[PDB]
Amino acid sequence: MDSNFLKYLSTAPVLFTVWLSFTASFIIEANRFFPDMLYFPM
Amino acid sequence: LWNEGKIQGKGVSVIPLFPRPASLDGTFPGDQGFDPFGFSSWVNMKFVAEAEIKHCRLAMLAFAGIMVESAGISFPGATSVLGSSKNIFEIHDKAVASGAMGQILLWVSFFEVVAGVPAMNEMLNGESSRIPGYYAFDPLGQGKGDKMGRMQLSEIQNGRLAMLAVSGIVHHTLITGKGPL
Amino acid sequence: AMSESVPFLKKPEALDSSMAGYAGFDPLGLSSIADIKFLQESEIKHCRIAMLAAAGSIAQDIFTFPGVSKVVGTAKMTGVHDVLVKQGAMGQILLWTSFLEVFGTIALLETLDGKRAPGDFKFDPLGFSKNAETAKRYQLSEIKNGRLAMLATGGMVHGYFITGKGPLELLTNF
Amino acid sequence: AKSKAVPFLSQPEALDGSMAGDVGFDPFGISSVIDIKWLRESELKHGRICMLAATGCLVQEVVHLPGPAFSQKMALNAWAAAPRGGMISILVAIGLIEMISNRFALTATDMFANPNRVPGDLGFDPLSLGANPANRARFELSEVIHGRAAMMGFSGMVHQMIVSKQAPIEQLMHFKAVDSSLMKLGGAAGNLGY
Amino acid sequence: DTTGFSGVPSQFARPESGVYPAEPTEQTFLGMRGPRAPGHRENFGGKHTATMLAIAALLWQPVSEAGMYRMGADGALTKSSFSNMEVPGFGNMKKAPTIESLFPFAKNGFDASPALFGKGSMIVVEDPRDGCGAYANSGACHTFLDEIGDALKK
Amino acid sequence: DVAGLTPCGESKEFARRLDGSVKKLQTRLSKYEAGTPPALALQKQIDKTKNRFDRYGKAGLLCGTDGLPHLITDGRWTHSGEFVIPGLLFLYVAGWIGWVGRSYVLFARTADKPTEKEIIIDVPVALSFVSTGFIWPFSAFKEFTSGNLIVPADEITVSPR
Numbered sequence: 001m002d003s004n005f006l007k008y009l010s011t012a013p014v015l016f017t018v019w020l021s022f023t024a025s026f027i028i029e030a031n032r033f034f035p036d037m038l039y040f041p042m
Numbered sequence: 043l044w045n046e047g048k049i050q051g052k053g054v055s056v057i058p059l060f061p062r063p064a065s066l067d068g069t070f071p072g073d074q075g076f077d078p079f080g081f082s083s084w085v086n087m088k089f090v091a092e093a094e095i096k097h098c099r100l101a102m103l104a105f106a107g108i109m110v111e112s113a114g115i116s117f118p119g120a121t122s123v124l125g126s127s128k129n130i131f132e133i134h135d136k137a138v139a140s141g142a143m144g145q146i147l148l149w150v151s152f153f154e155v156v157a158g159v160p161a162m163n164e165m166l167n168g169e170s171s172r173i174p175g176y177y178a179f180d181p182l183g184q185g186k187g188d189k190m191g192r193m194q195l196s197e198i199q200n201g202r203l204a205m206l207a208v209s210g211i212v213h214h215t216l217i218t219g220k221g222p223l
Numbered sequence: 224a225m226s227e228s229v230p231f232l233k234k235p236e237a238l239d240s241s242m243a244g245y246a247g248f249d250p251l252g253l254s255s256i257a258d259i260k261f262l263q264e265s266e267i268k269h270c271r272i273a274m275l276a277a278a279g280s281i282a283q284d285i286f287t288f289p290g291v292s293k294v295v296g297t298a299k300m301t302g303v304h305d306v307l308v309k310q311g312a313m314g315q316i317l318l319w320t321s322f323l324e325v326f327g328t329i330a331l332l333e334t335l336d337g338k339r340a341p342g343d344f345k346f347d348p349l350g351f352s353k354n355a356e357t358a359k360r361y362q363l364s365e366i367k368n369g370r371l372a373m374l375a376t377g378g379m380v381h382g383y384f385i386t387g388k389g390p391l392e393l394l395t396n397f
Numbered sequence: 398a399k400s401k402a403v404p405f406l407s408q409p410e411a412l413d414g415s416m417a418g419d420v421g422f423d424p425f426g427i428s429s430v431i432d433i434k435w436l437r438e439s440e441l442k443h444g445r446i447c448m449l450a451a452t453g454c455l456v457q458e459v460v461h462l463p464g465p466a467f468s469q470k471m472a473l474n475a476w477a478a479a480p481r482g483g484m485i486s487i488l489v490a491i492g493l494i495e496m497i498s499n500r501f502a503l504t505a506t507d508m509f510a511n512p513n514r515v516p517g518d519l520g521f522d523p524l525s526l527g528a529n530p531a532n533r534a535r536f537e538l539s540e541v542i543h544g545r546a547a548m549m550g551f552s553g554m555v556h557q558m559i560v561s562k563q564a565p566i567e568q569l570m571h572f573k574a575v576d577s578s579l580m581k582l583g584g585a586a587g588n589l590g591y
Numbered sequence: 592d593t594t595g596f597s598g599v600p601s602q603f604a605r606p607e608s609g610v611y612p613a614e615p616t617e618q619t620f621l622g623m624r625g626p627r628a629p630g631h632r633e634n635f636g637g638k639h640t641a642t643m644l645a646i647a648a649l650l651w652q653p654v655s656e657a658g659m660y661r662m663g664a665d666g667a668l669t670k671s672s673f674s675n676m677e678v679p680g681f682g683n684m685k686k687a688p689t690i691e692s693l694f695p696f697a698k699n700g701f702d703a704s705p706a707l708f709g710k711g712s713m714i715v716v717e718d719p720r721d722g723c724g725a726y727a728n729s730g731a732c733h734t735f736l737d738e739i740g741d742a743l744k745k
Numbered sequence: 746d747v748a749g750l751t752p753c754g755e756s757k758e759f760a761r762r763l764d765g766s767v768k769k770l771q772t773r774l775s776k777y778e779a780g781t782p783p784a785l786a787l788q789k790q791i792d793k794t795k796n797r798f799d800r801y802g803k804a805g806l807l808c809g810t811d812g813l814p815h816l817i818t819d820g821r822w823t824h825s826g827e828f829v830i831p832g833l834l835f836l837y838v839a840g841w842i843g844w845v846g847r848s849y850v851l852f853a854r855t856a857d858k859p860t861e862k863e864i865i866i867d868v869p870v871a872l873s874f875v876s877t878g879f880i881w882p883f884s885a886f887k888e889f890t891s892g893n894l895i896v897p898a899d900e901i902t903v904s905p906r
């Protein structure tokens with residue numbers, strides 16, 4: 001793959017948007033399968 | 043014998059329709075320059091040669107076994123435990139249930155684990171320089187000069203014929219639904 | 224250099240005729256993987272335990288010590304193990320053989336160091352290995368009989384697991 | 398200069414045929430991004446866990462520790478049935494093994510700080526089975542291949558335990574095929590949820 | 592440049608001890624190969640760990656069979672806990688902490704034997720095959736190969 | 746119980762919350778036919794509401810007079826799953842992010858041009874760093890004690906006062 005396109009995907013806004021979308025995506029998936037977690041269950 | 047250039051040799055094609063491959067040299071026994079798909083170029087020749095001879099020996103034993111059972115020739119008391127039918131498929135299923143096939147499987151597998159795999163690996167690695175298919179088994183001789191040429195070629199050709207025959211025999215029995223002879 | 228026992232296979236490159244019971248038989252190359260001295264000690268430990276087991280199966284079929292017929296039932300071979308664990312017979316045999324094998328662990332480590340031949344516990348109360356010829360000859364007899372005894376022990380116990388008869392009684396019947 | 402594993406791709410750098418199982422397989426070029434020492438440490442670690450995990454699934458099918466808490470033939474049920482104190486004991490013991498065996502060089506910045514440190518060599522040879530130098534090439538190859546195979550096999554067995562609520566050997570011996578009425582893949586967004 | 596996951600601290604600008612120990616090839620039976628103190632392997636190596644493991648295994652056999660075995664009028668003997676053995680001089684501590692406190696097999700219902708496990712609580716070995724063959728089976732057994740055969744004949 | 750609160754499993758106000766929350770959805774379900782996609786969606790919402798209240802009742806949460814769960818965060822171990830344990834999970838992740846970012850800014854200072862490494866991130870090196878965070882309490886405490894976390898006061902720019 002092109003090194004300049006990979007250096008573009010390494011830029012701060014792309015990584016910030018991808019990382020916070022990935023972060024948002026596993027918060028969404030964890031709240032989908034295991035919803036209503038007001039507490040650590042113990 | 044070896045008879046290089048006539049059979050088991052360079053410049054020898056059983057079928058001229060398929061061209062003689064450069065990758066197939068004349069060193070291996072029963073080499074008739076038959077390699078349309080050109081496996082000889084990328085395969086390990088020692089492995090495929092040893093595999094060929096083992097398939098041949100299994101097939102020749104298979105042909106003799108199918109012939110004896112199809113003829114109804116049996117060892118004493120064997121018909122009582124195993125299937126009375128002379129169908130090879132029926133006998134095999136009955137032999138599995140008796141445990142005869144399991145005992146044969148156990149010992150054949152044991153030989154392959156303790157002897158077949160070391161011999162194969164050492165031939166391929168270069169530890170013993172074993173000729174493919176050699177298992178040092180000449181109880182009644184017949185080896186030496188005869189083994190190098192005619193016997194090696196006779197075993198490879200008869201075994202190829204047996205492999206084809208056993209294949210034919212089982213599919214004949216399947217489509218017909220009745221055993222041969 | 225090709226194997227005497229398996230002629231199409233190579234010499235196993237860790238075995239030499241100065242060993243007892245050598246026939247060039249290591250087709251699977253286990254001797255390369257693990258120390259030969261350990262394997263020699265292990266072979267001899269397997270050989271001597273199975274030899275005692277083989278003689279035990281035979282003798283247990285022949286006669287039985289006074290009183291033992293009560294504690295055991297009609298059980299024989301492995302069958303007696305579950306009941307003689309209830310009484311302290313197997314417990315005491317385990318304790319004293321375990322006690323010997325703690326020293327056997329120290330002896331095996333000495334063998335790994337090379338300060339002792341494998342299986343050489345110097346045990347010669349009666350005199351048999353005074354002569355050198357007899358010593359090597361009896362070491363070869365010990366190893367061959369032991370390997371046979373191990374095979375026999377497998378045969379006797381599996382004959383019990385099939386028929387329940389025991390060695391002598393499987394000879395007498397069937 | 399092409400790969401032998403994938404003949405139409407270029408042979409990847411940091412793959413020079415020195416390592417065991419180095420058949421030239423790195424299409425995605427992770428070795429060009431991630432140092433091959435870390436990747437081989439991680440490959441050996443995944444495979445060794447998976448070799449035990451595959452053996453674990455099959456052996457737990459055959460043999461159990463005694464007691465009712467260890468009587469789960471199906472392996473995914475053993476996760477829940479096994480005593481929690483002991484499973485967390487296993488987890489803590491694994492963490493201790495990781496800190497001592499890696500010698501407090503655990504991160505991607507300080508493992509292999511010692512130039513003597515070799516990928517996968519944690520100093521684990523209790524019975525000195527690698528004392529023979531000749532077997533080292535074969536053993537390292539056969540460890541890598543056994544590891545890869547066990548990664549593929551354990552992954553299969555887990556996902557076959559999910560699909561068919563059956564342990565792997567008795568799923569092979571009491572095989573019932575996939576009906577497709579249930580176990581449909583995906584579908585969370587096709588029906589718009591629910 | 593940094594390779595990425597290289598693990599050399601200087602590449603990632605992480606503080607490094609710099610003192611990188613040489614790796615001795617010596618190995619102990621229940622320990623790992625690693626940098627060790629001078630004379631450590633000779634004193635506490637394979638010989639030590641194997642002997643101490645052996646001694647611990649021998650010492651385990653009384654420990655597994657720990658209990659007050661008292662013979663009655665008849666030859667039969669009764670196994671009681673060592674907690675029953677009251678101690679005279681420790682005031683309100685009449686029952687005393689004992690070897691069973693350190694090895695509580697009975698509390699957990701293990702029932703230890705000199706060889707580990709035991710009649711009560713022994714290894715459970717079961718046949719997954721369930722007494723049927725690999726192929727050519729009836730309704731009770733449908734193997735994977737039977738599914739291949741059923742797929743072929745349909 | 747604690748602070749004059751009642752366990753949510755026996756409070757009547759939590760039960761009337763669950764009953765009212767299910768009645769709101771059942772009256773929305775009463776205007777749809779059985780197999781239709783809105784009815785199926787509404788029934789799954791009812792199932793989720795019942796599961797939430799059922800789980801909360803058996804969790805050891807304490808409800809108020811209003812029938813809503815209340816969190817006790819004074820440190821008591823019978824209620825540590827509401828703040829102390831979720832807080833420990835947070836501090837582990839937060840210290841992970843902090844240690845990983847600090848390690849990356851210290852790497853980026855030793856670069857040929859330090860400020861390109863912060864707008865164009867060296868992703869293999871930064872992923873090496875995100876893997877470093879799992880043992881941050883030990884890594885950061887050894888960093889602290891070895892004089893590598895805290896810089897002395899005479900290496901920091903300050904205003905004249």
Ligand code: CLA
Pocket residue numbers: 479480481482483484486487490695696699700701
């Ligand atoms: C600090 C030491 C310590 C102590 C005091 C305990 C105490 C306990 N453990 Mg834990 N445990 C420990 C360390 C410890 N454990 C470690 C380090 C591990 C990880 C390897 C475990 C893994 C573990 C499991 C998985 C289980 C326990 C269980 C138990 C309890 C019942 C014990 C019993 O009945 O024993 C008497 C029983 C025995 C002595 C039987 C031993 C069984 C064999 C030896 C297991 C085979 C070992 C196997 C080959 C492992 C090899 C790997 C290892 C070398 C790394 C008891 C509370 C059990 C429990 O909670 O049950 C309620 C349980 O399920 N423990």
Ligand SMILES: CCCCCCCCCCCCCCCCCC(=O)OC[C@H](CO[C@@H]1O[C@H](CO)[C@H](O)[C@H](O)[C@H]1O)OC(=O)CCCCCCCCCCCCCCCCC
Pocket residue numbers: 138139140141142143144145147148149151152155723724725726736
């Ligand atoms: C020092 C160690 C010494 C150890 C010695 C023992 C180990 C030696 C090595 C052994 C290696 C394994 C050998 C087998 C051991 C068990 C033997 C046994 O009885 O097995 C047991 C089982 C059969 O089990 C049988 O069950 C019957 C009742 O149903 C009988 O009554 C008996 O119980 C038993 O014989 O064997 C199998 O299932 C084999 C399946 C087929 C395996 C391959 C067969 C040969 C290759 C041809 C196949 C071609 C297929 C083409 C595609 C077809 C697609 C449909």
Ligand SMILES: CCCCCCCCCCCCCCCC(=O)OC[C@H](COP(=O)(O)OC[C@@H](O)CO)OC(=O)CCCCCCCCCCCCCCC
Pocket residue numbers: 582583584585586587588
């Ligand atoms: C090296 C390891 C190799 C792993 C190989 C993976 C094997 C399993 C992969 C899927 C198998 C077949 C899928 C059919 C199943 C399938 O396609 O279902 C379809 C599903 C979407 O639902 P639909 O719109 O299809 O609904 C269709 C209707 O017919 C039913 O309502 O697609 C997905 O988004 C599900 C996958 C989650 C996507 C995100 C995954 C998690 C992201 C993690 C980061 C990226 C990882 C890779 C992402 C691709």
Ligand code: KC2
Pocket residue numbers: 619620621622623627631632635636639640641643644647
């Ligand atoms: C009388 C006191 C005592 C007892 C009762 C005892 C019992 C056992 C048992 C019993 C079941 C085993 C299995 C065992 C095994 C090991 N012991 Mg031993 N041991 C005792 C004393 C010491 C000392 C003073 C040292 C030591 C060591 C090791 C090492 C590691 C070597 C290494 O990995 O290189 C191993 C494997 C050295 C050390 O490094 O410990 C981390 C070390 O200096 N031991 N030890």
Ligand SMILES: CC1=C(C#C/C(C)=C/C=C/C(C)=C/C=C/C=C(C)/C=C/C=C(\C)C#CC2=C(C)C[C@@H](O)CC2(C)C)C(C)(C)C[C@H](O)C1
Pocket residue numbers: 076077078079080081082097098100101103104105106107108111129130131133134205206208209
């Ligand atoms: C070389 C070459 C090529 C080629 C080629 C070709 C044509 C290859 C063909 C290969 C064949 C035909 C192999 C057949 C093997 C059969 C065997 C070994 C027998 C098994 C039976 C057993 C063991 C049994 C049994 C039994 C006994 C006795 C008793 C019974 O009661 C039961 C039972 C039946 C179970 C190609 C074209 C690809 C290109 C290449 O460039 C060059």
Ligand SMILES: CC1=C(C#C/C(C)=C/C=C/C(C)=C/C=C/C=C(C)/C=C/C=C(\C)C#CC2=C(C)C[C@@H](O)CC2(C)C)C(C)(C)C[C@H](O)C1
Pocket residue numbers: 442445446447449462463464465466467487491494495498519699700701712
């Ligand atoms: C670290 C890492 C890796 C890894 C790894 C992994 C995943 C390792 C997993 C290891 C495991 C599973 C260890 C399990 C230990 C089990 C024990 C001790 C059982 C004890 C039973 C007891 C005490 C009992 C009892 C009794 C009770 C109470 C009551 C009865 O009714 C029941 C019973 C009679 C049984 C590797 C090595 C691959 C590589 C690399 O280096 C990185």
Ligand SMILES: CC1=C(C#C/C(C)=C/C=C/C(C)=C/C=C/C=C(C)/C=C/C=C(\C)C#CC2=C(C)C[C@@H](O)CC2(C)C)C(C)(C)C[C@H](O)C1
Pocket residue numbers: 448449451452521522523524525526527543544546547549550551553554557565566568569
């Ligand atoms: C190194 C070292 C030593 C050691 C050691 C150890 C612990 C050695 C252990 C090594 C092990 C446990 C190797 C196990 C490999 C398992 C594999 C490859 C399974 C693959 C499964 C597959 C492909 C599958 C599948 C399947 C699918 C999905 C469908 C299923 O329905 C069924 C099926 C099962 C067929 C010791 C300690 C002795 C000391 C020495 O000094 C140093």
Ligand SMILES: CCCCCCCCCCCCO[C@@H]1O[C@H](CO)[C@@H](O[C@H]2O[C@H](CO)[C@@H](O)[C@H](O)[C@H]2O)[C@H](O)[C@H]1O
Pocket residue numbers: 480481482483699
């Ligand atoms: C000799 C010990 C040397 C180090 C000891 C220090 C221990 C460190 C913390 C120990 C924590 C104990 O961990 C705790 O104990 C046991 C372990 O199975 C578990 O207890 C569980 O199993 C036991 C054993 O049958 C049951 O009797 C008990 O009812 C059940 O709750 C607890 O659920 C677990 O929380």
